Design a protein around this nucleic acid. Structure first.
Length: 85
DNA sequence: CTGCAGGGTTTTTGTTCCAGTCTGTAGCACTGTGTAAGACAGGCCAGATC
């Protein structure tokens, strides 16, 4: 980092993973690593979520079911709650 | 000092191919929603005329 890139370790270390992983890999790798510091989501805009709802034919209780489930596990809730829809 | 020509430079950006590994799509034969009445013709028995 010192010889060629002055010494900014954060930028160096984050980049390191990609080639070792992506040498023989996933897709998952592109994703987990792509989430990082920039981003994000944050929240899927309520309109997009709404689209997913009425276009995949999700019942309000079924949808809310999904919301609760995705939110409790690893959440980081993605979907927007009912009242905002 | 300037102007641009045409070279130096590193550093993008991509290049050809062979093992594969993942991922999204087309190929499959094939499905869902059209859903109830009347009109016209002919026969013929009933039933009223008279």
């Amino acid at each position: 980092a010192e010889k060629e890139e002055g010494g900014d370790v954060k930028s160096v270390c984050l980049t390191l993973f990609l080639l070792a992983l992506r040498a023989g890999n996933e897709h998952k790798q592109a994703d987990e690593l792509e989430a990082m510091m920039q981003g994000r989501g944050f929240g899927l805009h309520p309109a997009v979520c709404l689209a997913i709802r009425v276009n995949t034919f999700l019942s309000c209780s079924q949808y809310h079911k999904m919301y609760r489930t995705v939110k409790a596990t690893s959440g980081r809730q993605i979907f927007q709650p009912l009242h905002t829809l």
